mmCIF file of C-alpha atoms in Angstrom:
data_model
loop_
_atom_site.group_PDB
_atom_site.id
_atom_site.type_symbol
_atom_site.label_atom_id
_atom_site.label_comp_id
_atom_site.label_asym_id
_atom_site.label_seq_id
_atom_site.Cartn_x
_atom_site.Cartn_y
_atom_site.Cartn_z
ATOM 1 C CA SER A 1 180.534 125.540 117.899
ATOM 2 C CA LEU A 2 179.201 124.748 121.290
ATOM 3 C CA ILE A 3 182.098 126.602 122.771
ATOM 4 C CA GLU A 4 181.072 129.871 121.150
ATOM 5 C CA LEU A 5 177.371 129.309 121.604
ATOM 6 C CA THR A 6 177.876 128.612 125.353
ATOM 7 C CA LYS A 7 180.078 131.671 125.554
ATOM 8 C CA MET A 8 177.527 133.879 123.784
ATOM 9 C CA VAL A 9 174.760 132.612 125.865
ATOM 10 C CA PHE A 10 176.725 133.379 129.047
ATOM 11 C CA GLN A 11 177.709 136.730 127.563
ATOM 12 C CA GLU A 12 174.120 137.761 126.990
ATOM 13 C CA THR A 13 172.354 136.197 129.910
ATOM 14 C CA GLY A 14 175.047 136.430 132.526
ATOM 15 C CA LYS A 15 173.854 132.974 133.488
ATOM 16 C CA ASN A 16 175.741 129.697 133.661
ATOM 17 C CA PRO A 17 174.588 128.391 130.266
ATOM 18 C CA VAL A 18 175.454 124.916 131.154
ATOM 19 C CA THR A 19 173.147 124.707 134.104
ATOM 20 C CA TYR A 20 170.481 127.096 132.741
ATOM 21 C CA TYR A 21 170.192 125.585 129.293
ATOM 22 C CA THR A 22 171.617 122.103 129.137
ATOM 23 C CA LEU A 23 168.161 120.771 129.683
ATOM 24 C CA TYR A 24 165.285 123.131 129.797
ATOM 25 C CA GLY A 25 161.715 122.733 128.700
ATOM 26 C CA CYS A 26 161.030 120.736 125.632
ATOM 27 C CA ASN A 27 163.616 122.158 123.319
ATOM 28 C CA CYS A 28 166.646 123.212 125.301
ATOM 29 C CA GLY A 29 169.086 120.435 125.314
ATOM 30 C CA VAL A 30 170.348 117.654 123.119
ATOM 31 C CA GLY A 31 167.577 115.093 123.373
ATOM 32 C CA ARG A 32 164.876 117.514 123.202
ATOM 33 C CA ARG A 33 161.971 118.388 120.970
ATOM 34 C CA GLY A 34 158.486 119.383 121.932
ATOM 35 C CA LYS A 35 156.090 122.268 121.938
ATOM 36 C CA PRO A 36 157.876 125.182 123.615
ATOM 37 C CA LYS A 37 156.883 125.507 127.218
ATOM 38 C CA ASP A 38 157.762 129.124 127.466
ATOM 39 C CA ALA A 39 159.689 131.889 125.893
ATOM 40 C CA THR A 40 163.009 130.473 126.955
ATOM 41 C CA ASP A 41 162.092 127.132 125.614
ATOM 42 C CA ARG A 42 160.968 128.869 122.431
ATOM 43 C CA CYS A 43 164.355 130.491 122.022
ATOM 44 C CA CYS A 44 165.908 127.055 121.884
ATOM 45 C CA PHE A 45 163.253 125.878 119.417
ATOM 46 C CA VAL A 46 163.983 128.896 117.221
ATOM 47 C CA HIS A 47 167.684 128.171 117.581
ATOM 48 C CA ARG A 48 167.336 124.550 116.667
ATOM 49 C CA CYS A 49 165.270 125.654 113.605
ATOM 50 C CA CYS A 50 168.036 128.049 112.780
ATOM 51 C CA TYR A 51 170.591 125.264 112.814
ATOM 52 C CA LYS A 52 168.436 123.288 110.466
ATOM 53 C CA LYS A 53 168.731 126.033 107.835
ATOM 54 C CA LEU A 54 172.550 125.594 107.769
ATOM 55 C CA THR A 55 174.536 123.770 105.052
ATOM 56 C CA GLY A 56 178.215 123.025 104.832
ATOM 57 C CA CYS A 57 179.095 123.538 108.406
ATOM 58 C CA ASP A 58 178.625 121.793 111.679
ATOM 59 C CA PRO A 59 176.919 123.821 114.446
ATOM 60 C CA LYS A 60 178.261 121.500 117.106
ATOM 61 C CA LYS A 61 181.935 121.347 116.330
ATOM 62 C CA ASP A 62 182.834 124.099 113.930
ATOM 63 C CA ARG A 63 184.480 127.154 115.315
ATOM 64 C CA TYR A 64 183.766 130.609 114.006
ATOM 65 C CA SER A 65 184.988 134.101 114.771
ATOM 66 C CA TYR A 66 182.760 136.547 116.522
ATOM 67 C CA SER A 67 183.635 139.319 118.861
ATOM 68 C CA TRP A 68 182.005 141.122 121.710
ATOM 69 C CA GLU A 69 182.229 144.771 120.874
ATOM 70 C CA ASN A 70 180.281 147.305 122.881
ATOM 71 C CA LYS A 71 178.868 144.360 124.785
ATOM 72 C CA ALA A 72 177.000 142.842 121.805
ATOM 73 C CA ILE A 73 177.836 139.870 119.716
ATOM 74 C CA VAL A 74 179.366 140.704 116.398
ATOM 75 C CA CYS A 75 179.491 137.849 113.965
ATOM 76 C CA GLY A 76 182.606 138.852 112.108
ATOM 77 C CA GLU A 77 182.851 135.637 110.195
ATOM 78 C CA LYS A 78 183.064 135.718 106.448
ATOM 79 C CA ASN A 79 182.178 132.176 105.709
ATOM 80 C CA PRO A 80 178.634 132.445 105.186
ATOM 81 C CA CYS A 81 177.517 129.119 106.775
ATOM 82 C CA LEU A 82 179.632 129.980 109.739
ATOM 83 C CA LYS A 83 178.261 133.570 109.742
ATOM 84 C CA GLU A 84 174.754 132.089 109.804
ATOM 85 C CA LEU A 85 175.802 129.598 112.489
ATOM 86 C CA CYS A 86 177.222 132.438 114.559
ATOM 87 C CA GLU A 87 174.030 134.344 113.867
ATOM 88 C CA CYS A 88 171.881 131.446 115.046
ATOM 89 C CA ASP A 89 173.953 131.377 118.168
ATOM 90 C CA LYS A 90 173.802 135.104 118.767
ATOM 91 C CA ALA A 91 170.063 135.015 118.223
ATOM 92 C CA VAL A 92 169.537 132.397 120.860
ATOM 93 C CA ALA A 93 171.838 134.094 123.391
ATOM 94 C CA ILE A 94 169.915 137.354 123.032
ATOM 95 C CA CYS A 95 166.651 135.501 123.003
ATOM 96 C CA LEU A 96 167.576 133.716 126.190
ATOM 97 C CA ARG A 97 168.683 136.896 127.794
ATOM 98 C CA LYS A 98 165.462 138.633 126.749
ATOM 99 C CA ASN A 99 163.567 135.870 128.375
ATOM 100 C CA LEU A 100 165.360 135.589 131.703
ATOM 101 C CA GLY A 101 162.347 137.147 133.458
ATOM 102 C CA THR A 102 160.276 134.028 132.845
ATOM 103 C CA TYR A 103 163.012 131.520 133.022
ATOM 104 C CA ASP A 104 161.621 128.769 135.223
ATOM 105 C CA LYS A 105 164.098 126.362 136.941
ATOM 106 C CA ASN A 106 161.323 123.819 137.207
ATOM 107 C CA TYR A 107 161.629 123.463 133.404
ATOM 108 C CA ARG A 108 165.011 121.901 134.097
ATOM 109 C CA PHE A 109 163.068 119.033 135.627
ATOM 110 C CA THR A 110 162.438 117.145 132.524
ATOM 111 C CA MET A 111 160.616 114.612 134.621
ATOM 112 C CA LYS A 112 158.271 117.201 136.159
ATOM 113 C CA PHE A 113 156.513 117.969 132.859
ATOM 114 C CA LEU A 114 155.480 116.529 129.564
ATOM 115 C CA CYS A 115 156.348 117.665 126.089
ATOM 116 C CA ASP A 116 153.683 118.243 123.469
ATOM 117 C CA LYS A 117 154.384 117.447 119.840
ATOM 118 C CA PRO A 118 157.260 119.505 118.557
ATOM 119 C CA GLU A 119 156.460 122.752 116.991
ATOM 120 C CA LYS A 120 157.241 122.899 113.295
ATOM 121 C CA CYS A 121 160.079 125.204 112.238
ATOM 122 C CA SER B 1 179.437 126.452 146.085
ATOM 123 C CA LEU B 2 179.349 124.928 142.590
ATOM 124 C CA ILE B 3 182.800 126.610 142.175
ATOM 125 C CA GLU B 4 184.262 124.455 144.885
ATOM 126 C CA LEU B 5 182.239 121.408 143.883
ATOM 127 C CA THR B 6 183.340 121.667 140.272
ATOM 128 C CA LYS B 7 186.989 122.204 141.237
ATOM 129 C CA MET B 8 186.922 119.196 143.597
ATOM 130 C CA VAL B 9 185.258 116.914 141.095
ATOM 131 C CA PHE B 10 187.841 118.125 138.657
ATOM 132 C CA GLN B 11 190.618 117.538 141.211
ATOM 133 C CA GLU B 12 189.556 114.059 142.045
ATOM 134 C CA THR B 13 188.523 112.768 138.640
ATOM 135 C CA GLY B 14 190.696 114.896 136.371
ATOM 136 C CA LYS B 15 187.819 115.047 133.942
ATOM 137 C CA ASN B 16 186.047 118.138 132.746
ATOM 138 C CA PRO B 17 183.036 118.055 135.173
ATOM 139 C CA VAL B 18 180.976 120.043 132.721
ATOM 140 C CA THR B 19 181.245 117.423 129.989
ATOM 141 C CA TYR B 20 181.372 114.456 132.317
ATOM 142 C CA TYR B 21 178.858 115.405 134.947
ATOM 143 C CA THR B 22 176.624 118.167 133.897
ATOM 144 C CA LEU B 23 174.350 115.446 132.673
ATOM 145 C CA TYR B 24 174.893 111.904 133.675
ATOM 146 C CA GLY B 25 172.317 109.202 134.547
ATOM 147 C CA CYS B 26 169.368 110.247 136.662
ATOM 148 C CA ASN B 27 171.151 112.245 139.304
ATOM 149 C CA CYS B 28 174.164 114.141 138.063
ATOM 150 C CA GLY B 29 173.454 117.679 136.990
ATOM 151 C CA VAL B 30 170.601 120.084 137.559
ATOM 152 C CA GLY B 31 167.070 118.880 137.488
ATOM 153 C CA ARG B 32 167.963 115.222 137.226
ATOM 154 C CA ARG B 33 166.198 112.790 139.583
ATOM 155 C CA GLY B 34 165.735 109.010 139.398
ATOM 156 C CA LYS B 35 167.016 105.659 140.489
ATOM 157 C CA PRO B 36 170.776 105.792 140.009
ATOM 158 C CA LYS B 37 171.711 103.916 136.872
ATOM 159 C CA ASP B 38 175.149 102.995 138.122
ATOM 160 C CA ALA B 39 177.765 103.912 140.731
ATOM 161 C CA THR B 40 178.699 107.296 139.190
ATOM 162 C CA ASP B 41 175.035 108.232 139.041
ATOM 163 C CA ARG B 42 174.670 107.027 142.630
ATOM 164 C CA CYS B 43 177.586 109.269 143.618
ATOM 165 C CA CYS B 44 175.459 112.133 142.482
ATOM 166 C CA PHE B 45 172.388 110.906 144.264
ATOM 167 C CA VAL B 46 174.357 110.498 147.496
ATOM 168 C CA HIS B 47 175.670 114.015 146.980
ATOM 169 C CA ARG B 48 172.158 115.471 146.668
ATOM 170 C CA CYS B 49 171.182 113.388 149.744
ATOM 171 C CA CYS B 50 174.146 114.942 151.399
ATOM 172 C CA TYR B 51 173.018 118.464 150.500
ATOM 173 C CA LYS B 52 169.531 117.459 151.564
ATOM 174 C CA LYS B 53 170.733 116.895 155.140
ATOM 175 C CA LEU B 54 172.407 120.279 155.399
ATOM 176 C CA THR B 55 170.728 122.943 157.465
ATOM 177 C CA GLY B 56 172.145 126.399 157.611
ATOM 178 C CA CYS B 57 173.768 127.118 154.288
ATOM 179 C CA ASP B 58 173.332 126.975 150.576
ATOM 180 C CA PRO B 59 175.141 124.228 148.713
ATOM 181 C CA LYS B 60 174.984 126.177 145.434
ATOM 182 C CA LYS B 61 176.044 129.694 146.563
ATOM 183 C CA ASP B 62 178.097 129.488 149.670
ATOM 184 C CA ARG B 63 181.839 129.607 149.119
ATOM 185 C CA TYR B 64 183.902 127.616 151.517
ATOM 186 C CA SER B 65 187.422 126.879 152.305
ATOM 187 C CA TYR B 66 189.162 123.789 151.385
ATOM 188 C CA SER B 67 192.663 122.944 150.501
ATOM 189 C CA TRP B 68 194.163 120.341 148.296
ATOM 190 C CA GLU B 69 196.901 118.884 150.443
ATOM 191 C CA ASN B 70 198.876 115.917 149.205
ATOM 192 C CA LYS B 71 196.328 115.664 146.399
ATOM 193 C CA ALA B 72 193.430 115.021 148.783
ATOM 194 C CA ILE B 73 190.733 117.543 149.622
ATOM 195 C CA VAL B 74 190.749 118.914 153.105
ATOM 196 C CA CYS B 75 187.673 120.704 154.279
ATOM 197 C CA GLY B 76 189.592 123.118 156.430
ATOM 198 C CA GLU B 77 186.347 125.153 156.567
ATOM 199 C CA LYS B 78 185.675 126.081 160.301
ATOM 200 C CA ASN B 79 182.048 126.975 159.955
ATOM 201 C CA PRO B 80 180.081 123.894 160.663
ATOM 202 C CA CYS B 81 177.467 123.904 157.759
ATOM 203 C CA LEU B 82 179.929 125.071 155.172
ATOM 204 C CA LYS B 83 182.308 122.281 156.213
ATOM 205 C CA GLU B 84 179.530 119.728 155.935
ATOM 206 C CA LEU B 85 178.738 121.136 152.512
ATOM 207 C CA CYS B 86 182.438 120.858 151.773
ATOM 208 C CA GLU B 87 182.389 117.212 152.906
ATOM 209 C CA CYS B 88 179.431 116.458 150.611
ATOM 210 C CA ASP B 89 181.281 117.905 147.705
ATOM 211 C CA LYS B 90 184.467 116.293 148.782
ATOM 212 C CA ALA B 91 182.662 112.973 148.974
ATOM 213 C CA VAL B 92 181.059 113.144 145.567
ATOM 214 C CA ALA B 93 184.348 114.152 143.972
ATOM 215 C CA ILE B 94 185.981 111.119 145.542
ATOM 216 C CA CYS B 95 183.042 108.950 144.649
ATOM 217 C CA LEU B 96 183.079 110.045 141.025
ATOM 218 C CA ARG B 97 186.805 109.416 140.726
ATOM 219 C CA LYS B 98 186.445 106.020 142.426
ATOM 220 C CA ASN B 99 183.760 105.065 139.952
ATOM 221 C CA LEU B 100 185.412 106.253 136.878
ATOM 222 C CA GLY B 101 186.083 102.435 136.421
ATOM 223 C CA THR B 102 182.469 101.927 135.458
ATOM 224 C CA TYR B 103 181.649 105.396 134.035
ATOM 225 C CA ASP B 104 179.457 104.929 131.026
ATOM 226 C CA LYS B 105 179.397 107.703 128.471
ATOM 227 C CA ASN B 106 176.022 106.264 127.427
ATOM 228 C CA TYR B 107 174.427 107.800 130.545
ATOM 229 C CA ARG B 108 175.106 111.294 129.331
ATOM 230 C CA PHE B 109 172.340 111.151 126.787
ATOM 231 C CA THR B 110 169.034 111.933 128.445
ATOM 232 C CA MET B 111 166.853 110.248 125.740
ATOM 233 C CA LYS B 112 169.056 107.089 125.661
ATOM 234 C CA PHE B 113 167.691 105.669 128.941
ATOM 235 C CA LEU B 114 164.907 105.920 131.451
ATOM 236 C CA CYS B 115 164.994 107.233 134.974
ATOM 237 C CA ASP B 116 162.918 105.127 137.376
ATOM 238 C CA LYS B 117 161.424 106.723 140.528
ATOM 239 C CA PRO B 118 164.026 108.329 142.657
ATOM 240 C CA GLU B 119 165.107 106.273 145.573
ATOM 241 C CA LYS B 120 164.786 108.059 148.817
ATOM 242 C CA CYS B 121 167.924 109.200 150.590
#
């Protein structure tokens, strides 16, 4: 769920996920599709694509078990849609963390830039 | 700081400020600008106008002292910028609560409406 995804993203980035990633670029955030602006944005694109591959579970609302063990996300979750959901989430959290160096707060300003056609998953 | 802001908005409104106010209308939440769509939105605009007037401290980072006395915020903060920043936050919290009457969950969805040109403070 969002809860876990927000948690994981915090856990990896150390950043307030809600302010960093609620709206960012063309792909981070609920409304949002468009050619990735940058690596961060691309993580959210990849993560949205990841969600699309899922069947039988709801990324938004469904809870799943993961742990943080040695400071890394461990999707201990047997149920294999949930495992995949969890793994989508873990992927984006890591991805976002990896891309902190280029994170641009101006890409929060949805009105300060335009979104090209969405990239295809 | 956002810590104190978020607490106050919570205190006043009793709503989760993350779900309610991370993204609302054209002004509430990071990177949002535009003509306020309604009173709640305008609360947020006034609050950024408030921050805009501050010289000498950082509305995001700077912790400050307030108390909740008889379920009203008191900016007991001595230091003059931090107390102003407290008053901004105190004001928005109050404003958001006051305008809960007309709060429109519709305005949470970025792509559901347009933001016209920001008004000037």
